[PDB]
Ligand binder design. Structure first.
Ligand SMILES: [Zn+2]
Ligand SMILES: [Zn+2]
Ligand SMILES: [Zn+2]
Ligand SMILES: [Zn+2]
Lengths: 182, 182, 182, 182
């Protein structure tokens, strides 16, 4: 059985098995554009549920990555059909952290939004009743939100780790605080 | 750019870049429970849309797999939270083809539904207006439905394979016809 | 508090309060294009849940109606953006009952698909774990699927009533049987 | 044809054709819990899309309402199944404006979030590529955000009102600004 859920980007360069060292078959995997955990996405939350409730997975990694098409698209004006809907959530995050991102060098803005996004998705994941329950019923379950850079390993935006709803609060607000340091 | 969208199951026992000899960086990936393409799932369809429109991918592989817990769960009566919703589509598929599955021995059954599912999902994928437009505007785009025999090689063909909406009808209906007659 | 959930079409001529005689405030209302209950629609199922679990509603009416734009669109070839995704579920129903509908007079085909649709949505609704639970925990909860005709009151396609998962099976397969009589 | 899409809450205490003096047959309606327009909700957005593209509606009224159980539930910690997912968007809105709501007395709070929600939802509705395209192609389309005071008249203005994407930014941001400053 798998012990890890990897929520990553569909992006071809970011596959769990090569960013991780996990034994073959340890990785339950969900990938979607910009590694989102939208509150009302049955797709992702079904994986999270199946992971958490069927497989009793104890680690969920939301891995985002740099130079992520989703993030760029989120920030772009292009009509990408359904992607617009999907990335609107990311734009929400973008707008929510507009103070911070406005400051940043336009190019780095994408990479910040990637870091932030992961934070937000973990925050989303961790506020899921799926995860909140796993915890509430004392199941061990750690959420991690990382950002993998194509040319750099993990951005050490480590930030995003929750093992409880409370640690989520701290980690999340903490990560957001860290990222705001500039 | 990658050349394949791989829509597969979140089941680790199916790592795409490994089980195809394809390069890492060549598989745009979406995985979800029982590798579904639900008409109204922005998650998957965003991946597809990103794949088809942004990456201009030419091959969408929906790859199911045997001993897929998704498929098993669909056939269980067990309340698996959000997953029940997700898997009710698979149960539609089960019941849609209940007669075929009725005829089958109750283990063959799972692996049949697994194959059928791939077909249904290809069919869904191909009636996507995303995929349909790609085709309508001459975008070379083939849909492929495979099942990875988890305990084995790899059924590099469920027969379902569409390079157009019409080839979709044929391939799919033929696949179903076939799978209904061994 | 409301005692009835009305899942109807967004169609302006089909508002619950005027097709029903219910006291002001008795109607929890969800309407969407072609009054669907898609397994993985958080929107509708949230209303169903809220209805069933918060409001302890004891009656869910999926009211469809004749000359329903959704149904027509379902059957039509038009690109209606997100509507295509949404009505693809209805097309599924259409294709699932293609034998029956193929027979029918093209015009009546739409009205049959409307009757069928309601059956299917109730079937969907009733296989929801929300409803299955209400029942499993002995809560009184009756699903009704009707089809209101603009010029005729209810099509007496009465069919579609479930007060239990078993009655759903019967009512549903029964309704489908009735509709197949031609 | 109807001239208004009414996006409201499933709460019966809000019947649209009645509370507006509008004709029955003039309100295309979507209702859901806390009258949300989630970027990735095909349900609502299909209604909107049908409204905007098929019915060529010129007014989308998102109408929230006071003592909205949706809003209350969002603010409760209670596990309400699928509804938690649905309401996590409202909780984002709550927390997004936590400071404002922090400042408020904990009852004003609900009715504030109710108003804020309408604004957020209008904002979401207006960043819909559905609505954005209608505008981009000169379709006369105004978005309106109202709150029906359930115990009263009707706040025929939350201030949020957009006839374009730019008027969307202004109206929305202004609404938020306002609601943050009484
Ligand atoms: Zn990416
Ligand atoms: Zn599987
Ligand atoms: Zn209709
Ligand atoms: Zn309400």
């Amino acid at each position: 059985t798998p012990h890890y859920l990897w929520i990553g980007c569909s992006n071809s360069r970011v596959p769990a098995e090569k960013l991780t060292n996990l034994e073959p078959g340890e990785l339950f995997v969900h990938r979607n554009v910009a590694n989102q955990v939208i509150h009302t996405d049955f797709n992702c939350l079904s994986v999270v549920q199946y992971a958490v409730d069927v497989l009793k997975i104890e680690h969920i990694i939301i891995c985002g990555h740099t130079n992520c098409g989703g993030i760029h698209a989120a920030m772009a004006d292009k009509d990408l059909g359904l992607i617009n809907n999907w990335l609107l959530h990311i734009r929400d995050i973008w707008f929510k952290h507009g103070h911070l991102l406005g400051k940043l060098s336009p190019e780095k803005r994408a990479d910040m939004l990637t870091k932030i996004n992961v934070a937000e998705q973990v925050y989303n994941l961790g506020r899921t009743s799926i995860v909140k329950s796993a915890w509430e019923r004392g199941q061990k379950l750690s959420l991690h939100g990382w950002v993998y850079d194509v040319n750099d390993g993990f951005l050490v935006d480590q930030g995003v780790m929750a093992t409880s709803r409370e640690t989520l609060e701290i980690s999340y607000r903490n990560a957001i605080a860290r990222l705001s340091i500039l």
